């Protein structure tokens, strides 16, 4: 219920002051490295607390739906919350580094960190530091737990997978020639998977699983079978709802074609296009100019993307049902249903 | 003997082709992320193999001097070598990121990675990737070892400590006003410790210790008692031997005052200087111009740094002997003697 959902969110949110105290409390005042950590508190507070928390909040909902009454105590719930904030700091480090190699300007409604005065290129070393924080929170809360080295391995691994997709991106979509010869089905897909699906959907629940003992390669692979899918439908949606939706929205609210973004639509346009339009596309798609931009959107609409999306998301929420009823044998199906509910509802 | 020493080095060196095969062999050809890893091989080969290897080679010498005859087999020696290459990749990741936030040009006699064409700002994400490699080599060689989670914790920790000193640096020494009000004794010291001593001296042997079972907080703290010291004398030396030594040398061979580098000498000059010289120092020290540079070196020599260094390194190799005979009770003293030998021999 909203009563419950809302309640859970506020519980997580109000924990961040605690986390900050965990990462810095003692660094501060240390007669050698005190100022360094003194500044860390600021990096922490400036970049970490921000989104809906939907990622870290998934851990909490998952362990809740998975633990038996013998493991729903204060000391165990707080580790649920703390490992939830670890996903959030997992995102904050990638984001900070992301912006810099993008020369971005705004994030979470504020000015990117590196763009801040005094900062700039130091932001790289603070990207390293937030990441160093994912593991110090794990160690504070779970070092004396049978599941520890599992979480440790999960994080250092998903961090490797997102880093891989992050580089598939930095390659595929380069300003230079911009190139539309690369924006293809399997490469777009391959980017959504590593760069996003992994740490966004599998990682959260996967950490809930390891916490209630479930470490079987089979059940974990049954988790990848469907989270890696909602991770797809989520990105497609958060790409379609970009130009083609406005009436109530949030996130990277605005639009971005100024950046040569290998999005769904693009791959879909090139997919079903004529030589003239193809040339038009590789001529108007890729720059901040009211002119060329809207001509790209005219073409997408001229081609038939409003249809392409529907028949897809119309089949997506179906495949998912068949991927659940076929993969949620041990794991409580309610976990995915509840997750899907926050996702499967597009805007035209 | 040179016969032995030399032999050990070649054994380590010739292992890198193996390591590369460990990190990429399978990534290559994978129909989703193949090109990403295909490029990883290049980041690996371009930035990792380079120095004397003196860091990773310390692991090997240490485990050799510490293991009993029951643990000197192929399968155990190769983990010595592999964990040695993990220190090397620990350095390569910090270096790549270092250069970028310094806008450096040359490293290891070649052009910094980011300066390479096509590269540039992608270099950040490749700094993340080399680091992701320190943990995938640990997992390949030590995942089924009682010492594993100890090494894992050691690395994620020293990585946090160097990152802390790295930021003390980026603060203390800023171009802006350059500032000589910061270049002080305890802040210089505090930078050598975290930014360098830790992963350069303690980290290597510390990993040799965990491998032969020695995990006692007391013996480890007796290791920090003296490695953190040679880590000091090493940096002081590699700061003195900069302007004041040439007749046979290696490393950051050249000189660098063009960069406002919080080096030993500077702190030492400001230490014993007159108002005029102080102003001169904060006027001539900090830019690439044959003029001002040599006037800074004239002042250092005018003040008396050639003396300041001697009486120090003259007391250094003494304190060390007293820090050994007082801290090498369980641990074989020969380990530090052998290390000191590659260090304690300055050039005037």
From Swiss-Prot, chains A, B:
Mg(2+) 2 binds at residues 98, 102. Isopentenyl diphosphate binds at residues 52, 55, 91, 108. One of its GO terms (cellular component) is cytoplasm. Keywords: Cholesterol biosynthesis, Cholesterol metabolism, Cytoplasm, Isoprene biosynthesis, Lipid biosynthesis, Lipid metabolism, Magnesium, Metal-binding, Steroid biosynthesis, Steroid metabolism, Sterol biosynthesis, Sterol metabolism, Transferase. It is found in: Cytoplasm. Catalyzes the sequential condensation of isopentenyl pyrophosphate with the allylic pyrophosphates, dimethylallyl pyrophosphate, and then with the resultant geranylpyrophosphate to the ultimate product farnesyl pyrophosphate. This is Farnesyl pyrophosphate synthase.
